[PDB]
Amino acid sequence: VVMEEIIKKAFIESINNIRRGDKEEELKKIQEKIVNAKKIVVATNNQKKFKVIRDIMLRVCNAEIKMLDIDTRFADLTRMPALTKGLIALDIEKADLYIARGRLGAPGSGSMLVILDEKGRVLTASLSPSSVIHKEDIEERIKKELIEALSRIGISI
Amino acid sequence: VVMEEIIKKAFIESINNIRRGDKEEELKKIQEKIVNAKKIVVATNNQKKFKVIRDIMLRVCNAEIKMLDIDTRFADLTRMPALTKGLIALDIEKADLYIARGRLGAPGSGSMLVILDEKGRVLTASLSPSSVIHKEDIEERIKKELIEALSRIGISI
Amino acid sequence: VVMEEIIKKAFIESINNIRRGDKEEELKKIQEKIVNAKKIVVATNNQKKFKVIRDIMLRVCNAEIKMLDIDTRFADLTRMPALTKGLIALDIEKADLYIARGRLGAPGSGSMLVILDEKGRVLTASLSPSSVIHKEDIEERIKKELIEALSRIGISI
Amino acid sequence: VVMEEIIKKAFIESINNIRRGDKEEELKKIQEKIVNAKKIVVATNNQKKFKVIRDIMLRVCNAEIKMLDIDTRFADLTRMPALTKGLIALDIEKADLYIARGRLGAPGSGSMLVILDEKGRVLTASLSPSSVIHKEDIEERIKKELIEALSRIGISI
Numbered sequence: 001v002v003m004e005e006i007i008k009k010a011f012i013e014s015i016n017n018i019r020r021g022d023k024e025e026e027l028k029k030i031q032e033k034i035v036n037a038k039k040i041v042v043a044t045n046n047q048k049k050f051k052v053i054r055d056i057m058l059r060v061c062n063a064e065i066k067m068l069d070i071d072t073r074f075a076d077l078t079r080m081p082a083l084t085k086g087l088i089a090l091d092i093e094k095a096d097l098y099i100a101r102g103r104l105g106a107p108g109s110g111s112m113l114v115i116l117d118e119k120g121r122v123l124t125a126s127l128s129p130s131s132v133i134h135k136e137d138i139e140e141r142i143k144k145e146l147i148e149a150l151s152r153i154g155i156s157i
Numbered sequence: 158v159v160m161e162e163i164i165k166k167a168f169i170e171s172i173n174n175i176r177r178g179d180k181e182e183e184l185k186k187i188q189e190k191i192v193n194a195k196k197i198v199v200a201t202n203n204q205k206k207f208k209v210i211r212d213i214m215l216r217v218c219n220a221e222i223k224m225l226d227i228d229t230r231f232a233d234l235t236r237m238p239a240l241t242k243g244l245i246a247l248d249i250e251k252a253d254l255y256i257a258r259g260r261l262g263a264p265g266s267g268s269m270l271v272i273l274d275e276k277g278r279v280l281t282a283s284l285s286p287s288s289v290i291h292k293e294d295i296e297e298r299i300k301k302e303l304i305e306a307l308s309r310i311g312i313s314i
Numbered sequence: 315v316v317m318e319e320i321i322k323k324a325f326i327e328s329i330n331n332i333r334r335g336d337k338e339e340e341l342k343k344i345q346e347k348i349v350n351a352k353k354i355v356v357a358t359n360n361q362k363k364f365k366v367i368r369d370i371m372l373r374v375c376n377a378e379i380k381m382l383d384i385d386t387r388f389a390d391l392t393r394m395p396a397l398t399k400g401l402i403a404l405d406i407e408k409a410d411l412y413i414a415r416g417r418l419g420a421p422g423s424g425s426m427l428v429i430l431d432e433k434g435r436v437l438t439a440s441l442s443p444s445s446v447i448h449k450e451d452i453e454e455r456i457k458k459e460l461i462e463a464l465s466r467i468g469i470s471i
Numbered sequence: 472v473v474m475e476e477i478i479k480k481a482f483i484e485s486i487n488n489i490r491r492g493d494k495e496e497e498l499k500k501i502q503e504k505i506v507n508a509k510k511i512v513v514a515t516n517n518q519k520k521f522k523v524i525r526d527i528m529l530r531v532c533n534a535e536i537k538m539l540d541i542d543t544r545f546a547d548l549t550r551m552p553a554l555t556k557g558l559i560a561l562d563i564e565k566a567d568l569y570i571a572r573g574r575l576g577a578p579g580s581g582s583m584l585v586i587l588d589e590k591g592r593v594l595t596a597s598l599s600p601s602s603v604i605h606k607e608d609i610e611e612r613i614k615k616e617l618i619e620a621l622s623r624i625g626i627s628i
Contacts, residue, residue: 003263008406010264011384014233022287026265070325074545076171077559080279088548090433091577092322105279106160106562107167108183110309119404120434122237122262127284129309132184152267152286165563168541227482231388234402245391247590249479263405276561277591317577324578328547336601340579390485394593419593420474421481422497424623436551436576439583441598443623444493466581466600 003029003117030123030153034097034115040065041093043072043085043100052142053099060155066093072102080105082112083122090120101142108132113145124153160186160274187280187310191254191272197222200229200246200257209299210256216314217307223250229259237262239269240279247277254280258299265289270302281310317343317431344437344467348411348429354379357386357403357414366456367413373471374464380407386416394419396426397436404434415456422446427459438463474500474588501594501624505568505586511536514543514560514571523613524570531626534568543573551576553583554593561591572613579603584616595624 006029013019040063042053050067057065068089075084086100098120101113110130115123126149128141147157163186170176197220199210207224214222225246232241243257255273260266267287272280283306285291285298304314320343327333354377356367361381368379382403389398400414412430417423418441428439440463442455450458464471477500484490511534513524521538528536539560546555557571569587574580575598585596597619599612618628 002408004406004408007264008383011234011402011406014230015384015388017230019230019233022260022265022267022289024289026263027287027289030263030265070322070329071174072548073171073174073176074329074548076176077168077543077545078549078555079277079558079562084549087550088325091435091550092318092325094316094318103179104282106183106187106274107164108179108187108310109279109281110179117263119432120236121405122266124266125261125284127282127309130179130184130311132179132181133309133311152284152290153265154290159565161563161565165540168559168563172541172545226479227486229391231391231486234386234388235392235398236401236405241392244393245482248393248592249475249482251473251475276589278562321578325548328544331544333544333547336574336579336581336603338603340577341601341603344577344579387485387488387490390490391482393591417493418596420497420501420588421478422493422501422624423593423595424493431577434550436580438580439575439598441596441623444498446493446495446498447623447625466598466604467579468604 003033003121027154031155033117033123034150034153034155035061037061037063037096039063039095040097040099041068041089041095042066043068043089043098043102045071045073048139049101049142052139053101053146056143056146056157057099059157060150061097063096066095068093075102080112082114082125086114086116087120090116090118099146101145111141111145113142113149115149124149126152160190160278184311188312190274190280191307191310191312192217194218194220194254196220196252197254197256198225198246198250198252199223200225200242200255202228202230205296206258206299209296210258210303213300213303213307213314214256217312220253223252225250229257233260237269239271243271243273244277247273247275256303258302268302270299270306272306281306283309317347317435341468345469347431347437348464348467348469349375351375351377351410353377353409354411354413355382355403355407355409356380357382357399357412359385362453363415363456366453367415367460370457370460370464370471371413374469377410380409382407386414390417394426396428400428400430401434404430404432413460415459425455425459427456427463429463438467440466474504474592498625502626504588504594505621505624505626506532508532508534508567510534510566511568511570512539512560512564512566513537514539514556514569516542519610520572520613523610524572524617527614527617527628528570530628531621537564537566539564543571546573551583553585557585557587558591561587561589570617572616582612582616584613584620586620595620597623
């Protein structure tokens with residue numbers, strides 16, 4: 001059924017104080033939105049990071065997958081750069097799925113990879129430690145982030 | 158040495174396109190804010206969950222630690238409930254540090270634990286799968302959330 | 315062209331410092347979005363307030379106009395309640411246009427009427443003082459808010 | 472009497488449905504914060520725009536009034552540029568009051584002047600039509616915006 005209807009029931013449950021965790025139908029919908037996506041925009045300009053994300057997502061959906069034409073480094077001026085990058089992509093690209101990776105919050109907070117639907121809803125996300133504290137090959141780090149973000153909502157790669 | 162001056166310089170690196178990841182100085186400030194915290198507000202009404210968070214943070218700070226007087230279940234109507242709870246606590250309680258736990262994003266997106274400073278900046282966070290995807294005792298999960306949120310920015314428990 | 319391309323151009327102008335205020339085409343896009351809207355959701359339960367908003371918007375578009383099924387008073391816990399109400403409506407109802415009215419910001423900040431498109435972009439808005447500073451019949455107040463929000467982007471009813 | 476405590480009472484009124492518009496005490500607090508402000512930061516680099524805002528605030532308060540070291544035009548990549556500018560200033564400058572002016576929402580949506588307190592709360596704001604809709608010397612526009620923003624919360628120039 002439609003996402004708006006699934007969310008409506010959840011909002012009502014919360015209003016009437018019977019909300020007890022996520023529902024099965026909610027997780028299937030998130031899975032369905034990701035899986036049945038036809039267009040994905042990855043909010044990055046770095047071609048390496050894009051390859052990894054693209055190669056991964058090509059295994060779970062049959063979608064046209066695109067990189068961002070403009071420099072999103074300016075999202076690092078906002079409080080949560082990763083969401084900002086995703087919303088930037090939402091504003092300049094028509095798509096079913098937006099995947100953005102950048103800093104979590106304040107300088108020093110490390111990185112977030114986030115996945116948004118066509119309305120900018122946060123479907124899933126994953127975090128990584130600061131590179132100051134724990135340096136790692138960025139190809140393996142993104143690979144692990146994407147894997148967690150997908151597996152935590154029931155999609156296994 | 159004040160946070161504002163460090164973030165400024167980080168913002169300048171992004172503006173002039175020389176920003177290449179987080180800095181050591183940035184990490185120390187975040188560590189300082191959390192470690193030297195004297196007043197902490199936990200944006201929850203669940204006394205169990207508060208107990209776990211309080212006990213953990215007392216191992217890293219000598220701080221007066223308080224729970225929220227009001228029901229934050231209404232935050233679950235927003236796009237990112239966990240963050241909303243923190244900003245609610247920020248709005249009605251004076252404190253050095255704010256810790257909030259709730260839904261990540263949309264229904265089904267699992268849970269987020271966040272730590273905010275006195276200006277609502279995002280210092281660090283952690284994520285967990287929905288109990289639908291992975292069941293777990295909520296006391297051990299929350300303990301795991303806080304420890305990761307602390308450890309990913311270099312704070313040992 | 316599509317909204318996504320118009321915004322892309324504007325963003326490019328700001329990044330590369332050729333942006334000098336809004337463009338004429340950008341203005342037409344917002345107007346077109348309001349006029350050709352086929353489904354409108356008013357984020358309220360107040361049927362009185364709904365009447366005024368519905369009747370006015372029927373003067374500018376031939377659209378299905380709907381009221382919110384749920385209580386949006388809990389948005390008043392957020393930093394900007396009116397926007398929150400729009401985003402709540404956006405989450406649980408499929409529509410071309412979302413119109414929300416509520417508190418601007420902090421308690422005392424007065425009221426905001428905001429209009430959002432299907433992706434939650436802010437197309438236009440208008441404000442009113444707290445009834446503390448200037449009392450007014452709420453039906454004329456809202457009618458006044460809506461007309462200005464429409465007139466400020468060049469739409470006369 | 473402290474702002475967090477008045478907001479708590481307001482939040483409680485909204486939660487248990489006793490909230491009936493803004494209260495007198497709330498507006499006095501916003502007035503105090505603005506009038507008794509000791510440090511004000513204007514989120515701009517434009518000395519003309521800074522002059523007007525500074526000139527105006529000097530008639531209502533005796534405050535140190537400062538301009539931003541960095542260019543906040545990149546806030547135009549976010550969904551609500553004026554607010555983003557305010558939060559950029561909040562992140563990199565210690566102050567009692569933050570005044571930001573920029574675009575309201577999407578391209579074409581016109582301009583917003585907003586005033587934030589030291590925790591990033593929206594105290595008051597004003598809007599202007601796009602310069603496409605009504606041309607005006609920007610010095611008179613900003614002056615009219617600020618004056619509208621102050622009088623609507625009860626502060627006269």
